[PDB]
Coordinates of C-alpha atoms in Angstrom, one line a residue:
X1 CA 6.3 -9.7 -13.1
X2 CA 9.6 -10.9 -14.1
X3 CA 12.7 -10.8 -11.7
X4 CA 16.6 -10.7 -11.2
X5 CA 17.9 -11.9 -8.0
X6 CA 19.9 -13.7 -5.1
X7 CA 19.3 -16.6 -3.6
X8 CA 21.0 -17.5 0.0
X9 CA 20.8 -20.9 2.2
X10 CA 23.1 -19.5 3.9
X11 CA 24.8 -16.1 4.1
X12 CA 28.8 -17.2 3.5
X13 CA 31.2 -14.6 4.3
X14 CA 33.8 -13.5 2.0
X15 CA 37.4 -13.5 3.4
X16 CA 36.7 -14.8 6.9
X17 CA 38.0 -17.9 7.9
X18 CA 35.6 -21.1 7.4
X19 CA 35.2 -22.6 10.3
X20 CA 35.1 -19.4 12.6
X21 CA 30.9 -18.8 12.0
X22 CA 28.4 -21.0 11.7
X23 CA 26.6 -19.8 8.5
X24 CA 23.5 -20.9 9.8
X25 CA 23.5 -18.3 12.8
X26 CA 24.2 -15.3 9.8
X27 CA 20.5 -13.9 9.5
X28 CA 19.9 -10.9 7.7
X29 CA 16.9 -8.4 8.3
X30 CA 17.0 -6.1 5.7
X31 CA 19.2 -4.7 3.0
X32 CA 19.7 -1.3 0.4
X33 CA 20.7 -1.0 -3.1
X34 CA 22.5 1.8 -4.2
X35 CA 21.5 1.4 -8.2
X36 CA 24.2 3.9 -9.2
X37 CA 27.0 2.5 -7.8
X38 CA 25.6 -1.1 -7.9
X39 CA 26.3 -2.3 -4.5
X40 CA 23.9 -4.1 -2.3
X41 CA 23.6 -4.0 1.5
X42 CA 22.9 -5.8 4.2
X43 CA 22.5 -5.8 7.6
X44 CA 23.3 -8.5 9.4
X45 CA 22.5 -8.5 13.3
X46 CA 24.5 -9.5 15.9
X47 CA 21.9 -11.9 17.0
X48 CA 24.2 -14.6 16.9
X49 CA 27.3 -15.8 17.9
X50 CA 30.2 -14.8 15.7
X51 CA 29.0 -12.1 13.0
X52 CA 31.6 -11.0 11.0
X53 CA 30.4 -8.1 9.6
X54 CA 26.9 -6.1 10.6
X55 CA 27.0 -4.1 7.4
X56 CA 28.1 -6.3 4.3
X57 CA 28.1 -5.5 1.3
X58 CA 28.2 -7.5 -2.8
X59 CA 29.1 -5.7 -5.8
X60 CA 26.2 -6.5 -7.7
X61 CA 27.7 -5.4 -11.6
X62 CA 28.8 -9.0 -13.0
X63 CA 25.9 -10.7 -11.0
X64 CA 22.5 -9.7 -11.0
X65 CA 20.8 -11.6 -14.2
X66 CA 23.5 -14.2 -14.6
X67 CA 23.0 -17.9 -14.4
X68 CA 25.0 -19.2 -11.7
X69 CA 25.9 -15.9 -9.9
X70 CA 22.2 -16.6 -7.7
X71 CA 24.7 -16.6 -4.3
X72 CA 27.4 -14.2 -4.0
X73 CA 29.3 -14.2 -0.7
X74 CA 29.1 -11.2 1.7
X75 CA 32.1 -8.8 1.9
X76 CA 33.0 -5.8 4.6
X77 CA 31.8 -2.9 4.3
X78 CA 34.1 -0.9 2.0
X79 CA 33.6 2.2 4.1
X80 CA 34.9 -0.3 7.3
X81 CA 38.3 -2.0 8.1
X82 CA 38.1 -4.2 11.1
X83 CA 34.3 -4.7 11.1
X84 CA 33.6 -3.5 14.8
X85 CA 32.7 0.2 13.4
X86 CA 29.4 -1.5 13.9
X87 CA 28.2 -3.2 16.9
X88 CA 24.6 -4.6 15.3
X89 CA 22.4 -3.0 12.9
X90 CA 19.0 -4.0 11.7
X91 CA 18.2 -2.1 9.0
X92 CA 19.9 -0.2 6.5
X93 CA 18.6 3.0 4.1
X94 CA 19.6 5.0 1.2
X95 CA 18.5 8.7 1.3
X96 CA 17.5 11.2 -1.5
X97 CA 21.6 11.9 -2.0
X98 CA 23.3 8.4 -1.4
X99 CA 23.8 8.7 2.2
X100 CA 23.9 5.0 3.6
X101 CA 22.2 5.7 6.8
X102 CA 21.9 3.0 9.8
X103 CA 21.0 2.6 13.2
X104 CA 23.7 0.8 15.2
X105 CA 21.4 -0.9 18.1
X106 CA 25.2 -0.4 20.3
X107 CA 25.0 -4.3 21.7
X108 CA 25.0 -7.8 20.7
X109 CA 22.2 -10.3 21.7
X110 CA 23.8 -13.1 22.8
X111 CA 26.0 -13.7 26.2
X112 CA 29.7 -15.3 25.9
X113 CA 30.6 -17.0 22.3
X114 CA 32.5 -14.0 22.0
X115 CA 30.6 -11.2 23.1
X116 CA 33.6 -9.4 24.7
X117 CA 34.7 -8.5 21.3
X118 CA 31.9 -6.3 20.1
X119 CA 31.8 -3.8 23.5
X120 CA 28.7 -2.9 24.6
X121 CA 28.2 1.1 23.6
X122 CA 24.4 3.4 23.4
X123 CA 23.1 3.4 20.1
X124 CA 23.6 5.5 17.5
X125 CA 22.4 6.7 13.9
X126 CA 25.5 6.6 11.7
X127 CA 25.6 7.3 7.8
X128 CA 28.0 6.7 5.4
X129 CA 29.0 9.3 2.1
X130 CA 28.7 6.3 -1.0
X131 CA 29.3 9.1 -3.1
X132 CA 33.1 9.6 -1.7
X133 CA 35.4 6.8 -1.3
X134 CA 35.4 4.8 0.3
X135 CA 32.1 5.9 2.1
X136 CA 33.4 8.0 4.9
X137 CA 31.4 8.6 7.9
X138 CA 29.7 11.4 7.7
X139 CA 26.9 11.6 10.8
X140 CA 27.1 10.1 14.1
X141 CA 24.9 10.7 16.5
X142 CA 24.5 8.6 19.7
X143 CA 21.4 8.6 21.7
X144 CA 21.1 10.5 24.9
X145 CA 20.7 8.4 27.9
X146 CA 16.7 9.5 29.0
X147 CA 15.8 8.3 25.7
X148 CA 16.4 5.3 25.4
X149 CA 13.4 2.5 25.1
X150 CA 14.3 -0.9 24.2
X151 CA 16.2 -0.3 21.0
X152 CA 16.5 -4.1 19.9
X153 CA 13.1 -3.5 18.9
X154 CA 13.5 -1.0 16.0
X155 CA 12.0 -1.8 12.5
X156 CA 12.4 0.1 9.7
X157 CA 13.0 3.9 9.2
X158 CA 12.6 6.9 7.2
X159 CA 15.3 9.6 6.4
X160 CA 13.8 13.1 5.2
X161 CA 15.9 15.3 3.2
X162 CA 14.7 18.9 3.3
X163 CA 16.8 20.0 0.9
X164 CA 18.1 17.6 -2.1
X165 CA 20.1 19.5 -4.1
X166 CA 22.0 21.7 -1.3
X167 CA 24.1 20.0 1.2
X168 CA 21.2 18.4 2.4
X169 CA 21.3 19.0 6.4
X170 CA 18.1 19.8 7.1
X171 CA 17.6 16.0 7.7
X172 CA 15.0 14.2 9.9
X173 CA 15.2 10.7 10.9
X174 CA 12.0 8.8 12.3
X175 CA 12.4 5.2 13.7
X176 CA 10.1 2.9 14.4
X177 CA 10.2 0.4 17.7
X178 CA 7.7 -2.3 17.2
X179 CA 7.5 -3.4 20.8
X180 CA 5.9 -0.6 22.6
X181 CA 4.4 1.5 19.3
X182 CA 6.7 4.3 19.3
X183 CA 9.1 6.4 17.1
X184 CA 12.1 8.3 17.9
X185 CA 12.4 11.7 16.0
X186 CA 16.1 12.8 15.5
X187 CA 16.6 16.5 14.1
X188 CA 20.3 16.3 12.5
X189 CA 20.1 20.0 12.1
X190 CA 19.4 20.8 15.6
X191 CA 21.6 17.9 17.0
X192 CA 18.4 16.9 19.3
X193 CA 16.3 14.1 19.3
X194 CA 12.7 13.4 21.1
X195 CA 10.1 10.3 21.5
X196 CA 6.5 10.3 20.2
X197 CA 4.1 7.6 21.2
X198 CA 0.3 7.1 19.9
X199 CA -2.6 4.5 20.5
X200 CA -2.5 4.4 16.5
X201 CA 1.4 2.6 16.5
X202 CA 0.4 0.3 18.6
X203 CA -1.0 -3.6 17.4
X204 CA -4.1 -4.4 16.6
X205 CA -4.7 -9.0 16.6
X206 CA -2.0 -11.0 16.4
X207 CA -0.3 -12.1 13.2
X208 CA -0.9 -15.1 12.1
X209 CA 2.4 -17.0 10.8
X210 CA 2.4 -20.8 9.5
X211 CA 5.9 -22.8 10.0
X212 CA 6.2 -26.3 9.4
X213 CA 2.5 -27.0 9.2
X214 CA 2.0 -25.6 12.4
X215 CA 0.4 -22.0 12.9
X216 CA 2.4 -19.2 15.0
X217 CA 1.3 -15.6 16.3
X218 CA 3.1 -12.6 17.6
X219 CA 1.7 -9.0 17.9
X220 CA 3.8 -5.5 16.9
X221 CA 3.5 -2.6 16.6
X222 CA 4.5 0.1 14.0
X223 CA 7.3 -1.2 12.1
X224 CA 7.9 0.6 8.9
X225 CA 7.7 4.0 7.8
X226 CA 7.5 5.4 4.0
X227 CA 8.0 9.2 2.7
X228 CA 5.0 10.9 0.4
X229 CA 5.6 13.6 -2.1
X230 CA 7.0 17.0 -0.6
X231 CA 4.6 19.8 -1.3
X232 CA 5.5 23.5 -2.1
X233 CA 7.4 23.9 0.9
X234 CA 8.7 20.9 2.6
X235 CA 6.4 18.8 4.1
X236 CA 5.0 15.2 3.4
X237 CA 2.9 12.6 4.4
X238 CA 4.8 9.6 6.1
X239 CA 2.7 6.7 5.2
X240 CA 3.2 4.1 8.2
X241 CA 1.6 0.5 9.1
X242 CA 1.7 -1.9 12.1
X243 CA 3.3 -5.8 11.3
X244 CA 0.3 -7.0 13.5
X245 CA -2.3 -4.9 11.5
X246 CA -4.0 -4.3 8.2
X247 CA -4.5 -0.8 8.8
X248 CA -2.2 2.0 7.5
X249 CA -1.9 5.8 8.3
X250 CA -0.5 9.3 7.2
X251 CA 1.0 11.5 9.6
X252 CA 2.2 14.9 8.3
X253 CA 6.1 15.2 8.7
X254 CA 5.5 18.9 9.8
X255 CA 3.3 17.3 12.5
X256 CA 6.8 15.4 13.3
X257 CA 9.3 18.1 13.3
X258 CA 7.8 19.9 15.9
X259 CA 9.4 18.6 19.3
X260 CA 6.3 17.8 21.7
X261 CA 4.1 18.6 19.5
X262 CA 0.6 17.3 18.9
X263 CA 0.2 14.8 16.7
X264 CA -3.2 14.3 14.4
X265 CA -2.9 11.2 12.2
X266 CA -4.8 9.8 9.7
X267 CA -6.6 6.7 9.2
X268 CA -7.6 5.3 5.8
X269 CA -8.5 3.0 6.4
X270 CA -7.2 -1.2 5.6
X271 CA -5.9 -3.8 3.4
X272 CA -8.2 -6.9 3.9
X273 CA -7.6 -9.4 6.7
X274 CA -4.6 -11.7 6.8
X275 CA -1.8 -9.3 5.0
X276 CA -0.2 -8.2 7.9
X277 CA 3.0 -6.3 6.7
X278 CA 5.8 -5.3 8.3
X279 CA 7.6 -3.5 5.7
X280 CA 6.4 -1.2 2.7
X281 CA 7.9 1.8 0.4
X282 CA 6.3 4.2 -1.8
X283 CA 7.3 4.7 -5.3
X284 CA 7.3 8.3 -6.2
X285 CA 7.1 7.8 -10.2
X286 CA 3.2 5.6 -9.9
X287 CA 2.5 6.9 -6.2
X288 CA 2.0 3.1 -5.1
X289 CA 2.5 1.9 -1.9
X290 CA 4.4 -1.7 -2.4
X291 CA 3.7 -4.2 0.9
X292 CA 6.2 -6.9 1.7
X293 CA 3.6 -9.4 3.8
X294 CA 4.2 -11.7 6.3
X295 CA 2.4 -15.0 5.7
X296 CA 0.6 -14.6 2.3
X297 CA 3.4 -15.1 0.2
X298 CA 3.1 -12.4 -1.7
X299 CA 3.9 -8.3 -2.4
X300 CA 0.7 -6.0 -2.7
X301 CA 0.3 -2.3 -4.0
X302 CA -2.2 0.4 -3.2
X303 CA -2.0 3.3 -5.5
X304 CA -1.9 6.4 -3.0
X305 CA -4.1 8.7 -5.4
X306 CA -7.2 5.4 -5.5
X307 CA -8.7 7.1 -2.1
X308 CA -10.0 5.6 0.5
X309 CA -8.0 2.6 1.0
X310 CA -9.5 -1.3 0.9
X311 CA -8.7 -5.0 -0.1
X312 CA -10.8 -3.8 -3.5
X313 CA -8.5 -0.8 -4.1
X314 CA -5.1 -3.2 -3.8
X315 CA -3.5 -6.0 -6.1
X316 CA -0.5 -8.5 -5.9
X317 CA 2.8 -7.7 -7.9
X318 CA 4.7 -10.8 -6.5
X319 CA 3.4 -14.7 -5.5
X320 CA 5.9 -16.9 -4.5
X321 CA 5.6 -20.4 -2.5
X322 CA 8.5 -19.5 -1.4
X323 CA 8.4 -16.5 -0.6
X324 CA 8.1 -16.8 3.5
X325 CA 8.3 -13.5 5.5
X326 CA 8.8 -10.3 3.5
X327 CA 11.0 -8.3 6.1
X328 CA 11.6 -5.4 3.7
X329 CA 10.7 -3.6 0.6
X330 CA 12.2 -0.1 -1.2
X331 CA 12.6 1.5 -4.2
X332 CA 15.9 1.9 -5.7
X333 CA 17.2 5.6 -7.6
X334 CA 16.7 3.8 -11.1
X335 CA 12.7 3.0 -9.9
X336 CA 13.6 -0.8 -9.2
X337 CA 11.3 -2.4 -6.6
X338 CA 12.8 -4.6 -4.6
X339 CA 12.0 -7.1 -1.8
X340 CA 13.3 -9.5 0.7
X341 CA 11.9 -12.3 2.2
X342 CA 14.2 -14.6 5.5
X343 CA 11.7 -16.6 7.0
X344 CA 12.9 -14.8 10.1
X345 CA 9.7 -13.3 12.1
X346 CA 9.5 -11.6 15.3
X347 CA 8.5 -15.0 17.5
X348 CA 10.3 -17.1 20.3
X349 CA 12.9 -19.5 18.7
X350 CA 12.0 -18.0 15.4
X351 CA 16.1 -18.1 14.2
X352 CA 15.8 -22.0 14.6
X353 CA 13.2 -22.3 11.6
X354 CA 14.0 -23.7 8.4
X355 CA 13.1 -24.3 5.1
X356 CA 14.3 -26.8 2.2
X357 CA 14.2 -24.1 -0.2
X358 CA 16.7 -20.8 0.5
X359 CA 15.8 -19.1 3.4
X360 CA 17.1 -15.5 1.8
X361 CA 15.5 -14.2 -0.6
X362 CA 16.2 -10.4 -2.4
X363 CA 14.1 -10.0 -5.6
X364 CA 14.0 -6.9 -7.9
X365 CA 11.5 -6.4 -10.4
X366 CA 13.1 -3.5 -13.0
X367 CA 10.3 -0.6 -13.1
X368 CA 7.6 -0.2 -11.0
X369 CA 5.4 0.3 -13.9
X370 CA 6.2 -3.2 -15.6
X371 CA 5.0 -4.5 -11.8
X372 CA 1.5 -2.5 -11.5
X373 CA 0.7 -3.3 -15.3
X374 CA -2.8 -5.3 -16.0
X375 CA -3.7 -4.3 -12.4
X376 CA -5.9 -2.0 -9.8
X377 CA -2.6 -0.2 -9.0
X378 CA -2.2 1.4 -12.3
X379 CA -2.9 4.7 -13.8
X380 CA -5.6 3.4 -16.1
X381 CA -9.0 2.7 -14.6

């Protein structure tokens, strides 16, 4: 129930000259912590005008539960030099071995204001080695041309390692696009990559979204993507959800692997109407499923083992007034659960909104057992 965190009304750049951004235009979509080295990341579209860095990063060490220490400025990416490395990102992901993966969308979304200096390129999944220094790249993969499908829309993603404690190459990536209800497979082994499509990505009402007393809407589809536990050989369940739906689904990642394969997915079955998510992670140590949600203010939890799934089987780990849009949830290596909130949702002239309290918000609450504690998530019952 308690937490440690930052606070941002705006994201302020360290090392950049003021002046040269406006702060206001710096929105951030989703982040990673990498608990043993203690850096945070962000990703930082370039939505806007002026971005100076896609990936930044804040060395979290003499920060995280000190007073006055609530905003720390964003920095390059250590693993970077000029910043263009990256054209725009949306989302960034730590793997089972400390790989920073990302998925560099290859343009910016704006026209002029500076466009020219972050060329246009296809996208590409990129990861970084933390574990070296500093962080060299160490896959790059850029999409082929017949593949592409509106990558701007892509939500969260999922990296499966096959094999942890080797050199871990037998990696899949799965990405979600929330526009059309799809998700791109990417076999790093193989060095080939296919698209998968299915009536169950796709949205079911719109979401519901209340800004400045006034009540918005917009429909997606499947937007994040969480990995089960690996069984005697491999395989998984990859728990995944729609942002405009309270339903959520397994799909078995050896299902996934296999390039035009059949897919059999399933149902099981909802949350309770109004918690549209679109972002969610599952803890391996409890087997809960943690739900960053739109417009109730708060994070949920469904303990995977509690079968079937319904509003009765969930509880609330995290109420805040001012918590507006959850855009992303994960565990960190040390079991920290951690969740960000930027009042940023997927409608028309949605970057314009603001609030009088901090629009960022990144909260971590220390174990994921502390957080399920007097409720229907936890072991006991």
């Amino acid at each position: 129930a308690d937490t440690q965190g930052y606070k941002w009304k705006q994201l302020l750049y360290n090392n950049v000259t003021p002046g040269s951004y406006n702060p206001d235009n710096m929105i951030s979509t989703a982040f990673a912590y990498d608990a043993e080295g203690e850096k945070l990341f962000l990703a930082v579209p370039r939505k806007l005008p002026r971005v100076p860095y896609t990936l930044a990063e804040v060395d979290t060490k003499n920060s995280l539960g000190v007073k006055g220490k609530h905003s720390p400025l964003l920095n390059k990416f250590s693993g970077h030099k000029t910043g263009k490395e990256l054209t725009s990102i949306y989302q960034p992901v730590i793997d089972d071995c400390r790989r920073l993966w990302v998925v560099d969308i290859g343009s910016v979304e704006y026209r002029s204001r500076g466009a020219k200096d972050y060329p246009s390129h296809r996208p590409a999944i990129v990861a970084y080695d933390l574990k070296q220094p500093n962080y060299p790249e160490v896959v790059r993969y850029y999409f082929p041309t017949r593949l592409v499908e509106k990558p701007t829309y892509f939500g969260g993603f999922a990296v499966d390692v096959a094999n942890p404690k080797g050199d871990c190459s037998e990696t899949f990536v799965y990405i979600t696009n929330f526009l059309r209800g799809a998700l791109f497979i990417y076999d790093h082994k193989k060095q080939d990559s296919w698209n998968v499509t299915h009536p169950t990505f796709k949205a079911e009402r719109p979401t519901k979204f209340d800004y400045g007393g006034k009540e918005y809407e917009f429909k997606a589809g499947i937007f994040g993507i969480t990995l089960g536990d690996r069984d005697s050989e491999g395989n998984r369940p990859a728990y995944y959800l729609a942002g405009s739906a309270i339903k959520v689904y397994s799909v078995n990642t050896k299902e996934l692997k296999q390039k035009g394969g059949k897919l059999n997915p399933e149902l099981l079955g909802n949350r309770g109407k109004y918690n549209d998510a679109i972002a969610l992670a599952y803890d391996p140590k409890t087997k809960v499923i943690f739900f960053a949600e739109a417009n109730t203010k708060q994070v949920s939890c469904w303990n995977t083992q509690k079968m079937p799934l319904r509003m009765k089987n969930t509880d609330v780990v995290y109420t805040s007034s001012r918590f507006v849009f959850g855009t992303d949830i994960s565990v960190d290596s040390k079991g920290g659960l951690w969740f960000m909130s930027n009042g940023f949702p997927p409608i028309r002239k949605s970057e314009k909104f603001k609030y009088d309290f901090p629009r960022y918000r990144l909260m971590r609450i220390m174990d994921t057992q502390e957080a399920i504690a007097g409720t229907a998530c936890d072991m006991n019952a």
